[PDB]
């Protein structure tokens, strides 16, 4: 089996159209997401042309070995898609109209910057390369584009399924390769974190800053260091998931600026016992009374800046 | 292969069948399951009728090559099902009855709000897309439904295996497609959970309210912080297993509580001992004394107001 | 291919034997273990039966495409064991002796009550389904039934491998099915544990009992709560590796006690503490001086019934 | 089909290429990286040519199974590359030009000296087996050799895609084998380690050496041993991912340096105590105020011949 | 295809060489290894031999499928190889070398007595079942046993890969089995363990013992506890990676011992608190004074013993 041959010099336009059955596992340190959907292709290929009246039947249905079918891949998948051909129809003017269902780990990159208030646009990213006889074009039938309504990520509220028309026609390796960019648009569903993740998280901190109303310094010493240790143990009960990012994160942030906190607190339950048992009482009670303010003050003002620079 | 011709313009109907024969890998995180059972399918094909009495069979056998079989999948699967034909039998009309056994890791959303007292419906949905010359439709053969005693399901009792015998037939990308819905219903064994699970967590909990009965600002602020510290390592140790849900959990709801409690304590603590220090012992002795009482009791109240709003 | 035809109306007999070469992976959470063995079957098929002296061989060897093979298949297995023919040999009276080498992943439930005092029983069913030509039943060649001697299943002692001559025939989907309970009996290797489980976890308990012998109501709460949280580090440390069974465990029984235990410690030094502080230290000593004695005979007489009752 | 006859005695050249689609799961701890790429494969078989004149098309397209292909492997894989032949095209000469999409996960060792401060060149090894018939000997065009624009790989910058052109001839297993080295360079991502591993380190260790501003012999033993469980506990939270290194690595340095210095603290702050108890408090007070310098300018200098002597 | 005919009643010798090319997951809980290697094969086959002069070809290559090959397996597998035919060449007089290269999961028991200081021999055992037509019988040809001078196994050293030459014949289910043992000698490189594992576990061993010079039972509780739940977290940190042997370890021994230090150093904490408080503290000073010598010298005595028994 050959390609088609051009009436003329006219390139080969394969119309595609992904519809997405069942969207799971995305996982956002691997960066993928796996996908089950249906994959439909169409093409003219008038070799297969036949007269509805002889042939005795308005559409023929051929098995993939029996006709030639495009070698459609996907460029961002870890390993090729394990394909099931559904239908093959053509129609008399030999119109093909290709059906399958496939199953992929698409690998599409994440940007962790506004983590857990992020929103995300998926890859699956359609190639064809060109044969020496004809070239191929992809196509987009924007009504063989879409999604089960019952598609669920968990974790994620699923935006739009759609793709960018205009075919991305490039050269590589001394061959035409035509490209088409499907996007999937998600948004986190970040509820949970507050009264999971976020509010333990702050009580834990808030619990340290009693030391500015306490004077006993070995009861200071355990309120900072043992919420340090509460502090740690709490994040390693929370699964983040997160990679190691080039960049700074919105909860990276935060984060470093609770581990600062710890720091200074200890720092000034130091500073007020030093004082203190150097005799100068009046500076170590100024010191933790500003504290009181200072502290909370400091700390909603820097996460006013932080939610500001990132969002 | 073409699909058997109809005698008028009705569709062809494919009576379907599942036998439970293994169910095991229920994943609370990843919301699946994996299933090893018969699939049976029957259909009419008048094309392989035979008169009994001439060709001395009362059933011819064939393989699965050598006749149209239907294309049936399945929706909510990871990849297709790994399947090995049985048997494939034909009566003297034509009636055709296969069996193959499968395995499939099947995608089940499931609803933590009551764990871990929660009961689940596992959906199987079958499917089958219509062909240009007939329409297929599923139907459900109640005889072949069912599921093998030895079924086992760790952590969970198998209530019922039916099936929801009216098909849910709609049009997919301009063909019809009949869905046919088999639900395993499950309940969770919570018996382990109490003294694996509550009970302890509850006494580290009570272990925190004995600086009601203490005036030492530093035993009590080890008590608090120390416990509030075992409650997180306890944590660490029981496997939830449960994932990121849009939604608010019964267990969820407790645990956050339970957090809010820890940093309660801590505020009674630290006012308990302000003011001793500021010579005010009468009103500290006043606010340990009601939270000896205030504490279980608005704990006992509103974990009654959560178990009724779940429940 | 189609089966051996019957003299009379008689099933056929397929003589069986399971030889265990490789025994690894067993999974106390998941309830399966990876088996690596030789399946031999043998059944008289007449066709082809030939006369030694006019052929001049003893035994003729053919493909398993060649002749019919009865499909036997593993009831309790995740997907079909991965086989590999080794030999196929027919007699001349047309007794067929058929070898495969296959590994499988065998499902097969535990009882965790006596953990890690516990023996096993693993089961491997092995099964056929008749046909509409003839029937089909199963039988144990007692001779080809064995297990290498350098099987070896890391924690566990493997004392036999049987199987329960007596097949189970039963009616399944229209069809009889010819079951067969092949044994394998296992002893866990429960020497470690003493050493690396029970004693580190039986002197962190016992640390918390020196609050006996100490009136300072710091140090008692710092040994109290600090074991506690030893404790539960300790139990993170240990991969228990067990799943949630419906049931009461032995170890379970017990981990629930040493939990118990710290709760009534930590009363006991809030009780001895109130006391002394209310100006009544005669109580405050005597319930002390009792828990002495009171906390080990009470743990030794409870282990030593939980010991009786699971024994 | 035999390999292409030699014209005199010479070897077969087979023009290799490595284009880069896909770069993931570079494992630290397996040191393996998997990869998505094409190959491209060139050499000369005159049992192919064709008259131009008398053929009447310019390329000649064929299937794998019609012509001979030369066996090419990668040497360091774990198992063999899961390959999809793109196309095969005979220019009139007999000139082949085939083209493959292929997946492997490469084992490539990892020098960790410099850990996170690292970078890696990964290797993949082609190698060809000469033939009875014909040597055959593997060569680079280059104009072959590249990668994806959009080539990333979590957590490195990548730097290059190149090959060594010259080849590693060698015999083996009584056969001449010709080897290719194509190397990605690659560079860690360490921004994120400050913020997130070392200045959390850093503020934990820093705690420690407060203890140098107090003479409360239980405040210190509380400031040393619960930095140290903290500095475990922030170990643990961190994901290392180091696999275990016959070398000393940088980090690996550094962070047995902070281990001794806990250990030193805890010597300083014991004999602090004892001279303070056994009536010396000019020297525990001589000794305190040194560490104070002693601590911070040991770890700074200590350090600057660590960094040193690694880079 | 038939086996190669005896010319009188002697068994086939099949030649056989294992290369090793890759070496990687050593898994020392599964006590699994995967290799990738060259496997050579050798036998004469009368059938095939040919006059080279009238031939005009010194070698006539085959494929698989084309003559008859010996069935080889490996006993100690989790599954069957994968292997791809790297070569078949037939010589004059009908000597047959193949050569496959496969990748295999191999089961090989470890001996942990002497962790981390232990050497371990890998095996891999080649089988042949011989057939009724006449006996197989496997040989080593020890020119083509060798090893890749690249193979790597992380944290161990590659000492040699050899072949015990004379082959274990038995038999098996009626019929010989030919076995042959291929040895690889490693060694584990155990540099790192010291300032990776022991050091910092000796240090925080050595933290507790500073309780003997100190009187504060407040201090000495919080060292004591602190440091046990400080080498409790240090371990869970530390990837032991270790089954549950039935026999007893070397490191395995220690740590025992080190748990055991704990509770002792517990007792004298107590010892010493309750003779002071009993108005004894001569005595309690006695205990104290000896237990500074007692603990290091028996911690060192006891491990000179354990050291001795293990080495
Ligand atoms: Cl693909
Ligand atoms: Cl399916
Ligand atoms: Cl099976
Ligand atoms: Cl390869
Ligand atoms: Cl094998």
Redesign the interface.
């Known amino acids: 089996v050959?390609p088609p041959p051009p009436i003329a010099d006219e390139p080969l336009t394969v119309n595609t159209?992904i519809?997405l059955?069942?969207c799971?596992?995305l996982d956002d340190?691997?960066?993928?997401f796996?996908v089950?959907a249906?994959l439909?292709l169409s093409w003219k290929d008038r070799r297969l042309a036949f007269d509805p009246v002889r042939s005795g039947?308005?559409?023929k249905?051929y098995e993939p070995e029996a006709i030639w079918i495009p070698?459609i891949?996907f460029?961002?998948?870890?390993?090729?898609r394990?394909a099931?051909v559904?239908?093959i129809?053509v129609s008399p003017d030999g119109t093909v109209q290709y059906?399958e269902?496939f199953?992929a780990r698409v690998?599409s990159?994440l940007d962790f910057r506004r983590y857990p208030f992020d929103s995300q646009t998926l890859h699956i990213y359609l190639i064809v390369?060109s044969?020496?006889?004809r070239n191929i074009v992809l196509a987009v039938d924007l009504?063989?584009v879409?999604k089960?309504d019952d598609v669920?990520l968990?974790?994620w509220?699923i935006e739009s399924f759609t793709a960018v028309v205009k075919p991305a026609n490039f050269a590589?390796?001394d061959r035409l390769e035509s490209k088409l960019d499907y996007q999937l648009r998600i948004s986190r569903?970040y509820?949970?974190?507050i009264?999971?993740i976020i509010?333990?998280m702050l009580?834990?901190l808030?619990?340290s800053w009693?030391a500015f109303?306490?004077?006993?310094?070995?009861?200071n010493?355990?309120?900072?260091?043992?919420?340090?240790?509460?502090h740690?143990?709490?994040?390693?009960?929370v699964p983040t998931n997160l990679?190691?990012?080039?960049?700074?994160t919105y909860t990276?942030?935060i984060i470093?600026m609770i581990?600062?906190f710890?720091?200074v607190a200890?720092?000034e339950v130091?500073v007020q016992?030093?004082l203190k048992?150097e005799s100068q009482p009046a500076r170590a009670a100024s010191i933790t009374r500003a504290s009181r303010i200072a502290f909370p003050v400091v700390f909603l003002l820097a996460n006013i800046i932080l939610a500001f620079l990132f969002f």
């Open positions: 050959s159209g519809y059955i069942e799971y596992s340190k691997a960066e993928t796996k089950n249906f439909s039947v308005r559409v249905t070698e891949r460029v961002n998948v870890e390993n090729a394990d099931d559904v239908d129809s059906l269902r199953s690998l990159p390369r044969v020496d006889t009504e063989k879409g089960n669920f968990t974790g509220d590589l390796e569903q509820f949970s974190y009264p999971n509010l333990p009580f834990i808030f619990i009693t109303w306490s004077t006993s310094y070995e009861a010493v355990t309120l900072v260091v043992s919420t340090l240790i509460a740690i143990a709490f994040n390693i009960l990679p190691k990012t080039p960049y700074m990276g942030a470093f581990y600062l710890y720091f200890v720092i130091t016992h030093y048992v």
